[PDB]
Design goal:
binds magnesium ion; binds chloride ion; rod-shaped; Lipocalin; alpha+beta; homopentamer; transport (chains A, B, C, D, E); membrane (chains A, B, C, D, E); 6 strands
């Protein structure tokens, strides 16, 4: 009934072993206290008892000089990534460029590379969708926008905000580690595991410098991702403003047409009032006259036209 | 008539005693001046005369190596929290992970844990309400939004702004304490109470390091809370923009329909003017003709239809 | 004709004396150059020739170990504050908590307390007015807002922006003083007036520490005021957005009702066109028939109703 | 054909001499390289080869212990300022407060004073215009705003943004100089011209301290100007929001009136349909009856009134 | 099949040679590892193994004391710039002002000058287009804006945002290099190539100081560019707000005219209802009277006019 961790252990030779271990047993094996493996923070990287404990959203990892541990890897679609890349990356000719460096360098490089790839994939999924939605929405020949595309844009904007928050947290953690040389020195766990051995093992190679360079590379990649996401958000805001202006302009055009038609209808009704008054079933002295009917019809139509033209001219003067 | 403090004292063994003490008596017992216990700031943490005086909104606490004091705990619903958790947390197997550390560590951990739990509970109450209100409001099939839900959203946004201010103050205080090592050293009140004893009592354990780790943990939790609240505010702003665009699009659609109907009415009235003119009670030469009535009716209807179609085509050309 | 200062001098014993002194005479008495008393900055605090020269908007003060000087105190409603509080605060049992400390501590504490009280009073005047104006404006049952209340809100927002600027300047000055220990040491003017005497006069009491604590207290109070003002501005912006959404929703509802009525009027006019055509004074073959009139009337009314219903259904389909 | 500088030289005694000098000759005389006098930056202050080279927009100056040089002073309306103030300020009883200090102090004080006066004059020109334009625009009794005043406000806002950029650059340059003591020491060009002489010439007076105080004074003045400009921009934004709300409220009121009139017209047309149907030239059985005409007229008018009242009540219910 | 670099090598004497080299061969020749030439960052400047590796968007360069290398220069329109300026700039009398300095100074100066010229050209292309588009759009005499110009403005705003991001990255990289003296010292690659030779070769000239001055110059140029771009964005936002206000004012004016015409039409229809009622084909007692027809017509017209005037007065009262 005790809580357990689903642990995937990658050895220094790339061998992978998956099992389940009691939390107390894991603490005893790793020489860590219970508070060290709480993983309470959304993303964090810490060095406790010469062990690199890190969490990035759903990825919880513990790096020791002997091996790497992935915790709570189930129901996250991580099996493909783990069993297809990590044996190759840690113990092969993969994209990792820190192979001659100790195991922790390869481990942290692989973890940061996977996380940066996940963020870049999220951005590369979001960008075309947002771009095409904005292009459809800011189309100047549409009187009104599509509301389903508006909802899609809202969902994509929420996803982009979440991605920006994730990238900002990544950058903040990496920069906080890079700022202090003490954290960089602590990150070299293999160096501090046997300081006497590494006093002569390091033949002029600085582990702290290599860690600083790797973290700087990943921080620069995260900064590029953040810049791209910020540009996307700015473009979204500009497109929203353009949509507002387009809708207002269409409303103004429709209102102008409606006002002109209202002027025409008002003139027609104004002279139809005279027509109806002459059409009442009341006795008058103009029934005997013959040209009176045609004269009234002609003056009604001509006056309606003239009043409509005068009202249009007045509208043009008012709108300058 | 002198002002008094309602003091709840938790001993190192977890015993709880509630009473009322004169302010001067409290100053004499704690070895503190009057200005130290003013609690004038909304949130503050200070170390005065080897005592940790802190306030977080309605929670005022004084931590000494011997015991903990809660001041002005009445009419705040704090009795349940106090008498149900603190005896267990300070002197039991609770969630506190600093039990082997001196009493002040457990005290500050419990206080910070309670405050972070209160903030997290406020956020977890606000988030579903705001989410459901926005989902109802940004529904694309609604011609107009619900104004009662708008008022609810406004109240929830005010509450969220207050929560963000509280989280920001928490983060600022914790970060200000963490920045200077002097404050961290001062926080270890038991260490400085008897420096001669603790010169040998601390068998290789660094109290300052433990305090730094605890404060870093709580600062990271507060940072996560602040990130979540900022994401909620950004989502609120995006939903407001989407609501604006939806309302404008609905207005444009309704205006287009009204303009088309106005065109139809204008054409109908234009030919009804001819109908009325022919319907006047004035003598003419066309009463004798038989087909004239049907011809006039037919040309009126056909011309009304043709003018309506031409006006619709003109509107389509104007709106592109 | 030479410029003069209206000087109110408060002695160390609380005695108050008001007079007018030539600027050159004041410079000679205070041992300060002309540039020191320019008071060109809206708010500043400086230590020149062992004298604390400060200005906060309309309050210009010079603090020396012997006494305090208030300059240009006329036509500012400051007489009540001066002659009712300062004799009591500097030489009595007032709210000042630095009485055993040298005179400059009491002086600067009284000045900062008065300024923070003025800012807090401005905020406590602005807050209820803004709150009630927003509550009236964001009322969901109002079709349109009250424009006089809008102007009142604009004036209150301008006042709140000015208050925020004042609080920000206060915080910036206090934080700039607190950042450098040299400024804090300079602030202890009585300590540096006779360093030989104060080498033994200070029996274990640190004047710099007391000054730092006092400035920290006032900075925290100013930070609380700034947080409250920022919350007020954020609430104002949110209320403005809610007002915009409410007005747009009311416009949409009115437009929908107008469109439905336009559909009804259009159908009525469409069948009134047939009515008028049958009502023309032209010969036809349907006058002999008896049921034709009732048939035409019935079909006109029924078709008007049916076309209105069909148009309403079309509008419902269009608006989804 | 070689490029030349129009140089105005002010001697230590205030004598002014205007001439034109070849760029190479100026470099040889001042002991400076070509890159030093490029003046490529909008505003900069630098110390090269014991010479203070500064540019502030159109004002290019080179300060040496012997004299001051103004370059490219033509076609800028600077002749009045130069020949009316600088001889008086550098060698008289002007507003300069650094007369006993070496010549470079007076020179830099005069230059910074002129630039701060120019910025303050720009702000004092912009502020009344913007204030009166906003007051005219936010008038609650105007149905629509004046568009010419809108264009004036746009131009003034662009000018205010340019002024804010200039003030920000001024503040940034002054603060960057003040941050590093090395730059402040370099600014004392007369001190470093003959260090052996000034080792004993400076009888207890610190040139670096005086330079720091002068730069702090001008930085505080620039900060006050920036605060005023930021307040003006915030007021402009608030006035724009108030204008938006006023226009929306006026639109809503007009729409409500139009909707009520549309209800009235719809009821009138609904009963005029019955009137027209009874007015058709078709045989019926109601011509014989005498009271039928008055009954129809009365029911038409009464029903029109009742339907209008019912529609108004329905609108009131809908708008709550 | 191995990846290759298209390398353009500029010798210290200005000779240019273009070829293609295997990546491994380039690493061997430059003494650099594979990770050094990844060019994964949008812009970066680094010093690896005494070589300055930099990338600025599409421009990838490697600076060694012997020569300069441009990588991946094809299909970028860079041939003109390379073969027309760089031989002249590096080995001639060009705009470079660091000719007596070692080769790396000239190389980095030329690269930074080209990049700053590219950014300035982009800004100088964007600014007139944006200015003219805004001037056309904010024209107060236009009832509605041009939507094609709106799309052009949106595209130009996206381009301006990209330019701002590029300038910000440039400034960040230059400032990060300038902040640390270690990076500035590393940048002097020729100095560290043969430290023994340059211990006496540098006859009182500080390479680090020259590098700092050059980087400061380019940072100031980039800051000016960023200020101009920010001013352009602020002007764009202000113009958008002015366009919104203009469209709202035009809508309000059109709505007022439509409401007045609706009042007129409503009065005309109200009295036409009486006209139609009197015009019904129903028997009455007023056919015998002679003046009744003219009386009805006169009262209808007069009442229509009076009701229209009263409605206009009511509208004026409502709108204040
Ligand atoms: Cl509208
Ligand atoms: Mg609108
Ligand atoms: Mg008739």
């Amino acid at each position: 009934v005790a809580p357990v961790f689903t642990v995937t252990k990658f050895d220094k030779q790339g061998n992978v072993t998956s099992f389940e271990r009691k939390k107390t047993e894991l603490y005893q094996e790793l020489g860590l206290q219970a508070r060290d493996l709480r993983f309470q923070h959304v993303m964090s990287i810490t060095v406790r008892n010469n062990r690199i404990i890190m969490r990035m959203e759903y990825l919880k990892a513990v790096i020791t000089p002997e091996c790497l541990l992935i915790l709570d890897y189930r129901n996250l679609n991580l099996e493909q990534w783990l069993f297809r890349e990590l044996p190759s990356q840690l113990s092969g000719e993969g994209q990792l460029v820190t192979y001659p460096l100790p195991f922790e360098f390869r481990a942290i490089e692989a973890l940061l590379q996977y996380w940066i790839n996940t963020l870049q994939g999220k951005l590369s999924i979001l960008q075309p969708l947002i771009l095409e939605t904005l292009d459809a929405l800011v189309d100047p020949k549409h009187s009104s926008v599509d509301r389903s595309k508006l909802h899609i844009l809202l969902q994509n904007g929420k996803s982009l905000s979440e991605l920006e928050t994730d990238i900002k947290i990544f950058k903040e953690s990496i920069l906080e580690i890079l700022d202090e040389e003490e954290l960089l020195e602590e990150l070299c766990v293999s160096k501090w595991s046997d300081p006497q051995v590494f006093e002569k093992s390091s033949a002029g190679i600085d582990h702290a410098e290599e860690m600083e360079l790797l973290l700087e590379n990943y921080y620069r990649l995260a900064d590029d991702l953040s810049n791209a996401a910020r540009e996307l958000r700015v473009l979204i805001d500009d497109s929203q403003s353009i949509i507002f202006i387009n809708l207002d302009s269409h409303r103004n055009v429709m209102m102008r047409l409606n006002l002109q038609l209202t002027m025409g209808t008002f003139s027609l009704s104004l002279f139809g009032l005279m027509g109806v008054a002459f059409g009442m079933n009341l006795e008058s002295s103009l029934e005997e006259d013959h040209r009176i009917f045609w004269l009234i019809t002609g003056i009604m139509f001509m006056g309606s036209g003239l009043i409509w033209r005068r009202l249009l001219s007045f509208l043009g003067r008012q709108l300058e």
